[PDB]
Enzyme design. Sequence first.
Site, PDB file in Angstrom:
ATOM      1  N   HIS A 257      -1.789  22.309   1.603  1.00 31.27           N
ATOM      2  CA  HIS A 257      -0.886  21.357   0.951  1.00 31.27           C
ATOM      3  C   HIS A 257      -0.427  21.911  -0.393  1.00 31.27           C
ATOM      4  O   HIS A 257      -1.249  22.281  -1.230  1.00 31.27           O
ATOM      5  CB  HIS A 257      -1.584  20.026   0.709  1.00 31.27           C
ATOM      6  CG  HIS A 257      -0.703  19.031   0.046  1.00 31.27           C
ATOM      7  ND1 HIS A 257       0.135  18.212   0.764  1.00 31.27           N
ATOM      8  CD2 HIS A 257      -0.487  18.770  -1.263  1.00 31.27           C
ATOM      9  CE1 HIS A 257       0.814  17.464  -0.086  1.00 31.27           C
ATOM     10  NE2 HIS A 257       0.446  17.766  -1.319  1.00 31.27           N
ATOM     11  N   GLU A 365       3.579  -7.552  -7.550  1.00 27.65           N
ATOM     12  CA  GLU A 365       4.415  -7.113  -8.661  1.00 27.65           C
ATOM     13  C   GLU A 365       4.943  -5.692  -8.475  1.00 27.65           C
ATOM     14  O   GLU A 365       6.072  -5.394  -8.877  1.00 27.65           O
ATOM     15  CB  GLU A 365       3.654  -7.203  -9.975  1.00 27.65           C
ATOM     16  CG  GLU A 365       3.202  -8.597 -10.383  1.00 27.65           C
ATOM     17  CD  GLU A 365       1.981  -9.121  -9.627  1.00 27.65           C
ATOM     18  OE1 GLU A 365       1.239  -8.315  -9.011  1.00 27.65           O
ATOM     19  OE2 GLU A 365       1.754 -10.355  -9.686  1.00 27.65           O
TER      20      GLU A 365
HETATM   21  C1  LIG Z   1      -1.785 -10.271 -10.333  1.00 27.42           C
HETATM   22  C2  LIG Z   1      -1.522 -11.704 -10.533  1.00 27.42           C
HETATM   23  N1  LIG Z   1      -0.215 -12.096 -10.351  1.00 27.42           N
HETATM   24  C3  LIG Z   1       0.151 -13.399 -10.565  1.00 27.42           C
HETATM   25  C4  LIG Z   1      -0.747 -14.334 -10.896  1.00 27.42           C
HETATM   26  C5  LIG Z   1      -0.324 -15.760 -11.200  1.00 27.42           C
HETATM   27  N2  LIG Z   1      -1.088 -16.699 -10.445  1.00 27.42           N
HETATM   28  C6  LIG Z   1      -2.272 -17.256 -10.752  1.00 27.42           C
HETATM   29  S1  LIG Z   1      -3.100 -18.109  -9.437  1.00 27.42           S
HETATM   30  C7  LIG Z   1      -1.654 -17.822  -8.425  1.00 27.42           C
HETATM   31  C8  LIG Z   1      -1.585 -18.271  -7.083  1.00 27.42           C
HETATM   32  C9  LIG Z   1      -2.773 -17.915  -6.247  1.00 27.42           C
HETATM   33  O1  LIG Z   1      -2.646 -18.501  -4.941  1.00 27.42           O
HETATM   34  P1  LIG Z   1      -3.767 -18.227  -3.880  1.00 27.42           P
HETATM   35  O2  LIG Z   1      -4.180 -16.805  -3.908  1.00 27.42           O
HETATM   36  O3  LIG Z   1      -3.295 -18.763  -2.611  1.00 27.42           O
HETATM   37  O4  LIG Z   1      -5.009 -19.104  -4.415  1.00 27.42           O
HETATM   38  P2  LIG Z   1      -5.362 -20.671  -4.291  1.00 27.42           P
HETATM   39  O5  LIG Z   1      -5.217 -21.223  -5.678  1.00 27.42           O
HETATM   40  O6  LIG Z   1      -4.390 -21.291  -3.292  1.00 27.42           O
HETATM   41  O7  LIG Z   1      -6.751 -20.699  -3.719  1.00 27.42           O
HETATM   42  C10 LIG Z   1      -0.744 -17.097  -9.163  1.00 27.42           C
HETATM   43  C11 LIG Z   1       0.591 -16.699  -8.544  1.00 27.42           C
HETATM   44  C12 LIG Z   1      -2.161 -13.844 -11.093  1.00 27.42           C
HETATM   45  N3  LIG Z   1      -3.108 -14.565 -11.631  1.00 27.42           N
HETATM   46  N4  LIG Z   1      -2.424 -12.558 -10.886  1.00 27.42           N
HETATM   47  C1  LIG Z   2       0.728   7.916  -6.450  1.00 36.21           C
HETATM   48  C2  LIG Z   2       0.453   9.321  -6.164  1.00 36.21           C
HETATM   49  N1  LIG Z   2      -0.895   9.665  -6.134  1.00 36.21           N
HETATM   50  C3  LIG Z   2      -1.293  10.974  -5.880  1.00 36.21           C
HETATM   51  C4  LIG Z   2      -0.375  11.904  -5.632  1.00 36.21           C
HETATM   52  C5  LIG Z   2      -0.767  13.377  -5.458  1.00 36.21           C
HETATM   53  N2  LIG Z   2      -0.241  13.957  -4.280  1.00 36.21           N
HETATM   54  C6  LIG Z   2       1.038  14.522  -4.093  1.00 36.21           C
HETATM   55  S1  LIG Z   2       1.420  14.756  -2.402  1.00 36.21           S
HETATM   56  C7  LIG Z   2      -0.192  14.165  -1.951  1.00 36.21           C
HETATM   57  C8  LIG Z   2      -0.626  14.118  -0.594  1.00 36.21           C
HETATM   58  C9  LIG Z   2       0.384  13.402   0.284  1.00 36.21           C
HETATM   59  O1  LIG Z   2      -0.056  13.461   1.671  1.00 36.21           O
HETATM   60  P1  LIG Z   2       0.838  12.758   2.776  1.00 36.21           P
HETATM   61  O2  LIG Z   2       1.306  11.400   2.319  1.00 36.21           O
HETATM   62  O3  LIG Z   2       0.047  12.823   4.050  1.00 36.21           O
HETATM   63  O4  LIG Z   2       2.102  13.706   2.911  1.00 36.21           O
HETATM   64  P2  LIG Z   2       2.322  15.103   3.679  1.00 36.21           P
HETATM   65  O5  LIG Z   2       2.474  16.138   2.616  1.00 36.21           O
HETATM   66  O6  LIG Z   2       1.144  15.341   4.584  1.00 36.21           O
HETATM   67  O7  LIG Z   2       3.514  14.879   4.516  1.00 36.21           O
HETATM   68  C10 LIG Z   2      -0.874  13.783  -3.034  1.00 36.21           C
HETATM   69  C11 LIG Z   2      -2.323  13.283  -3.023  1.00 36.21           C
HETATM   70  C12 LIG Z   2       1.063  11.447  -5.674  1.00 36.21           C
HETATM   71  N3  LIG Z   2       2.098  12.304  -5.736  1.00 36.21           N
HETATM   72  N4  LIG Z   2       1.351  10.197  -5.928  1.00 36.21           N
END
Ligand SMILES: Cc1ncc(C[n+]2csc(CCOP(=O)(O)OP(=O)(O)O)c2C)c(N)n1
Ligand SMILES: Cc1ncc(C[n+]2csc(CCOP(=O)(O)OP(=O)(O)O)c2C)c(N)n1
Lengths: 620, 622
Positions: A257, A365
């Site tokens: 690779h 996100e």
């Molecule tokens: C990474 C992230 N993105 C957004 C939120 C905003 N947020 C807090 S609780 C929630 C909803 C969670 O719903 P679910 O996972 O169904 O849990 P429930 O309360 O229904 O058990 C959101 C969108 C969060 N806390 N974390």
């Molecule tokens: C988010 C991220 N993490 C790590 C890497 C490091 N890296 C570059 S290519 C690769 C391997 C990719 O393998 P694959 O998806 O199987 O592609 P191939 O070359 O086999 O087609 C890695 C680990 C990257 N570029 N991006």
Amino acid sequence: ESYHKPDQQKLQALKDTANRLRISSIQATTAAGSGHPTSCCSAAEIMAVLFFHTMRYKSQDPRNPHNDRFVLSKGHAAPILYAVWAEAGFLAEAELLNLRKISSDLDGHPVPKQAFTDVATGSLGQGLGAACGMAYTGKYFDKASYRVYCLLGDGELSEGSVWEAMAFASIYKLDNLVAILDINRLGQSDPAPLQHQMDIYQKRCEAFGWHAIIVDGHSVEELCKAFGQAKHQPTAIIAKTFKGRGITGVEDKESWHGKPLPKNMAEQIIQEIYSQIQSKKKILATPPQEDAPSVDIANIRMPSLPSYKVGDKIATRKAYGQALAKLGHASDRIIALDGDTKNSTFSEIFKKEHPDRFIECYIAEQNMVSIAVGCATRNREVPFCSTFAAFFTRAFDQIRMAAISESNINLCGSHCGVSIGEDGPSQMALEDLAMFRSVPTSTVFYPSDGVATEKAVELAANTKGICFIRTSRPENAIIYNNNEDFQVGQAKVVLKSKDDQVTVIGAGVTLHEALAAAELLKKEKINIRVLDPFTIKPLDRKLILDSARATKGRILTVEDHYYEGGIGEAVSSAVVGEPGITVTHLAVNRVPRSGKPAELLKMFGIDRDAIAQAVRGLIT
Amino acid sequence: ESYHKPDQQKLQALKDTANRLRISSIQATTAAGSGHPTSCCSAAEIMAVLFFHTMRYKSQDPRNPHNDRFVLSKGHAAPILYAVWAEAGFLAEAELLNLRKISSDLDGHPVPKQAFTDVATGSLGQGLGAACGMAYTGKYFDKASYRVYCLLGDGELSEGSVWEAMAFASIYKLDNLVAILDINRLGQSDPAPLQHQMDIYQKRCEAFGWHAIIVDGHSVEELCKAFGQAKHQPTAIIAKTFKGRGITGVEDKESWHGKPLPKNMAEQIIQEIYSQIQSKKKILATPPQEDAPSVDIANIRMPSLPSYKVGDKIATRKAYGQALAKLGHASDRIIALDGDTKNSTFSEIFKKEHPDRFIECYIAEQNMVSIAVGCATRNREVPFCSTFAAFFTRAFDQIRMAAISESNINLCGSHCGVSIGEDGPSQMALEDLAMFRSVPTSTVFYPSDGVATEKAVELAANTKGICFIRTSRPENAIIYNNNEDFQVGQAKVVLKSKDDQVTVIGAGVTLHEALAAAELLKKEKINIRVLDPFTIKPLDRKLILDSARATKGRILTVEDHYYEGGIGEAVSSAVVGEPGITVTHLAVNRVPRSGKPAELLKMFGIDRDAIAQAVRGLITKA
Ligand SMILES: Cc1ncc(C[n+]2csc(CCOP(=O)(O)OP(=O)(O)O)c2C)c(N)n1
Ligand SMILES: Cc1ncc(C[n+]2csc(CCOP(=O)(O)OP(=O)(O)O)c2C)c(N)n1
Ligand SMILES: [Mg+2]
Ligand SMILES: [Mg+2]
Ligand code: NA
Ligand code: NA
């Protein structure tokens, strides 16, 4: 419209093309001394078939809005992307040998200085999300006939962001989207987890709502057939391939690779590949149906001035939703995206008024940002994403890559700082100014009242690059007249007198705390100047220094953010070395905790009393 | 131990417990005026069964190393976590009403200042990865009998990080791990995508290698049974529930996420729930089998000094791998994690020497960080994760939450800056100093040669908080004798004279460019002081200022990083306002491009010629 079932000569021409693409990938990476020929070679038949049988595009106008889109999610296969565009007649063949040179734009991974590239990849697992944005735009906004094809690696499928995109595409019925999985068994440093267990890939894709077809990825005929059938679902073409296919002794081997072939080996291998090519005649690309609509790139203006009233209370998070909905009446290009937080960020107001242009991205996100990038490609849409600012940290690599992609997206992050109160630090954005300031194309708006928020939304819509708007939970008073003029890089002096003792710089909740401190200090016959930056990046260095020169050179910066990378460090970096200028910095010094908003501002030393005490200490 | 098949009296007690947990979740959130009672109520039978039938733990010692682990991934259900620990006798019942107060540690989401919390959640989708680290540690390192249970929401399952953890658990055969999915149909602002399509959840979990069991999540008996059967695979209990279960008129309705009941309504609902409780008698927890091993928490010392010689050439990325492998011989607690980049970061050197303590995390940086956090809980392991520094941006929320979790993890990011050359900007870390400096518990090491790298690895192992080591691709000379002493927060002056006209601060490749600039400038009778920070955070303010005062007040920083949040801004923030001090800053001003390392350092203005030109300009402007 009908599939053209290729004859044996067309199939042989596609094989010849695939083999030319292998040769070029080897030549270019051997010339450069770096690159990923084995990652190119597993994809050669896929690339040949997509570019010279399946897709429809203008070979001389790669950015044309009617073209099918191709996204190379496994961006380290860039040399084979460049080779197809030479084969299609856009790129001079000789330029392929200049891969990775400072004198060339054929860089190590694809970038949008290349007309044939919309988004930069190279950080794996992001291309499918961008492709989803392109396909969503094609089906629901452009309402056009172009299709979207995204090539992924198999190691790449370990990234969670890919599966967010998989789920998005099935929720939104992206039946104009095809993912091609290059299941070449190997990642960078070992076999990919599933190796050639093609049935497990199929089950995973099917469980996520995709029509999943296993093919021999080195059969041009099977690829033509699989790509030739549209479906009512997003379609996953799960291609069994060998890494380094066609390179004798390297095919299907570990330890290759990102390793170029040495010159002697490249020459021998190229001779053997060339012996398999039956004709030098190249296939011509086929053009698209021209049904994408015209798009107007004119500046987008709010339909009226803000209609707030000085002294009324509104949180900037709510002003954001109101302003975004208002701007949506001025241009159909405005689209809103949110990650299951629309009732907290107030993007729900936009959803209510312009539902066709709201994209619910769910609690994902990373994907949300990539969708926005995809929608902004070819200038089709003007996207505003929103969530809590803290959760944009979940998408920092997508944002980073968005800047490398020269993307024009707008992000609004709510619930900044300790002033949210009781939820505690998991929900408190305290590093978002640091994060967004480190994105080189960024403009960072920190509006302090509802008027400034509406102005920031309008400015952001018309500003290139990564625009971030930091919104807040406390209801604070409107302090600006509705007709106050705002501009990027222009701060405002919101309180001043002839005998000000220090210039206090605050923003959002800390601007209001600074105004409250000024009232406390008046009772002690101490006047302070109060300055609202408006944008943290770029910073109004001139007004800051002119203010400081009127206040005995003294600056105090107070922010609901950690010390590093925020307002105080931006100010210090702007003024360091200026004769007579001093800077005192109040910020949050450690992970916070739950309490009422006012209690936390006090505990973390950024409330009115902390500001007043810091002022008293400076004068003494 | 055999499954204890519960009798109807135990089942009724579990129902009573679940209803007490509902009541407390309502009381606490109504008292606070905020919180998530409906998210608590969907999970009440799950919590009752886990804490009062299935799990084994010491109720007065929640951190005990022999206990089963519980991870509340859906952290906004914190009030029901607090309620179970009161029910178990650890927390005082009266304290539950102090939820979210500044005078309490029962904060809005769980945090490790609580003895019963190992990792902070509240950023959704991270708890399963932490749980995977706990389960991996239990099965492969501790080799103990404890199991790990992780409760997730349904909206939460939209996070890709969850699916990284799903895949990790099946790869690594984590048969001691159970994920409980609270499929209550609803997220925050709308139904979750799959709603009550239980069959699709099952297919997705099975396709990812889990044994997947659909249950009525409000049936204490079905829950006891599903939890009572161990498997050879990680097991997903896919629980069909109703949000707000037991709150009449709120159950299964939108518009109630994160909304407390008003006092009048809480009183009426609580009366109704209380009418369903048959007995006030509480169930006792059952303690665990004590088979976790004893762990040596002493200071970790390299078995020998670095074996480099001044003038030798080595890239700090390779020195990292050598140093980490060497450290592994000094402590049984060192583990290494990498995301399919071990041949680039040189963590492969550790894998070769200590393969049983290397964890291949594949191309999944978010999960890798969470695994490390989980392994570090209860001080079981000392983890060092690695990838390219640029790809740690993919894990920033996990790193952010690691600091909120008071976690001691070590991260080494390679391939920093434009000096990597030909791959181009997608691989170039240019914002990692900004990122890690904004993590409040962080120590940021930027070693400039192989010796400094080995010393940084040793110091990091013994330093609390989020330690970051920034490594580099160019093969620069060793400049430190092997016997140089290094300390967090202590910089080194590597070139000085009585006639120095500027203090030039560089690090990694730019330290070597600064030394080359010094050699060039000596031809013109210009001497410069050269200072190597060693740690960017904390910064050696005293040595920087003392140096600047010996060099006409002038500082020039030069860094292979963007201007914002890096070395130059750290220095400016440290010295601003000091009389006579000036700071000039050379950094990378925009997204770079491909070329040879030296060509890019030139193009972006951070090479020896740019440094020399800046120095001359400072002298002549004076
Ligand atoms: C990474 C992230 N993105 C957004 C939120 C905003 N947020 C807090 S609780 C929630 C909803 C969670 O719903 P679910 O996972 O169904 O849990 P429930 O309360 O229904 O058990 C959101 C969108 C969060 N806390 N974390
Ligand atoms: C988010 C991220 N993490 C790590 C890497 C490091 N890296 C570059 S290519 C690769 C391997 C990719 O393998 P694959 O998806 O199987 O592609 P191939 O070359 O086999 O087609 C890695 C680990 C990257 N570029 N991006
Ligand atoms: Mg592969
Ligand atoms: Mg839910
Ligand atoms: Na990608
Ligand atoms: Na914009």
